[PDB]
Every structure is written in structure tokens, then in C-alpha cells.
């Protein structure tokens, strides 16, 4: 009976972790690659600003 | 960025001073030739004056 329960429950909790768990490293790949991008287009003109730094 | 557009803002508007200095002083140049090339004009008229008095002399 209430055994059902928990055998039910505890299959169904297995469930959630697992599947997220790929999204989480999807997601944090995503912002990673992201703020790459962000760093390679941050350094550029911020030389080309040094260059035309007082000329 | 920002202080880029500001060094974009600084570098035209000296260019803007020279071109202003620049026209004010091709005026004043073109007006002073043409003022001495008058004289020069002037000169030989008063150069043919004084050569008709001396031959009525």
C-alpha cells in the first residue's frame, strides 16, 4: 500500500534530477561561450582605444 | 564606446577652428592683394600724371 507509494514516488523523483542535470551543463556552456564572446569583443577596441589614447 | 565617440567629437571640432581661421584668413589675404594691386594701379596713374606736367613744363 503505502509501500506502492514510496516505490512510485522514489522512481518518479530519479526522474527530475537526471533530466535537468544535461540542461544545467547545456546552460552553463551557453553563458560560457557567450561571455567568450563578449571578452574577445571587449578587448579590441578597448586596444584601439589605448592606440587613440592621446593619439 | 563612449570616450572613443568623445575623441571622434574633440578631433572634428579643431578641424572646425582651423577650417573657420583658415577662410578668415584667405579673405583677409585676397583683400589686402587686391587693395595693393589698386595702389600698384594708382602708382602708375600718378607716374603718367607727373610725365603729362613735365611735358606741359
Given at each position: ?6 516505490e ?15 540542461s ?11 561571455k ?20 | ?22 577662410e578668415?584668413?584667405?579673405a ?5 592683394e ?24
Amino acid at each position: 500500500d503505502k509501500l506502492k507509494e514510496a516505490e512510485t514516488r522514489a522512481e518518479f523523483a530519479e526522474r527530475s534530477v537526471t533530466k535537468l542535470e544535461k540542461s544545467i551543463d547545456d546552460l552553463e556552456d551557453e553563458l560560457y561561450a557567450q561571455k567568450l564572446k563578449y571578452k574577445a569583443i571587449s578587448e579590441e577596441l578597448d586596444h584601439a582605444l589605448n592606440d587613440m589614447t592621446s593619439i | 564606446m563612449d570616450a572613443i565617440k568623445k575623441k571622434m567629437q574633440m578631433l572634428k571640432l579643431d578641424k572646425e577652428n582651423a577650417l573657420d581661421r583658415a577662410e578668415q584668413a584667405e579673405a583677409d589675404k585676397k583683400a589686402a592683394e587686391d587693395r595693393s594691386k589698386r595702389l600698384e594701379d594708382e602708382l602708375v596713374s600718378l607716374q603718367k600724371k607727373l610725365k603729362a606736367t613735365e611735358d606741359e613744363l
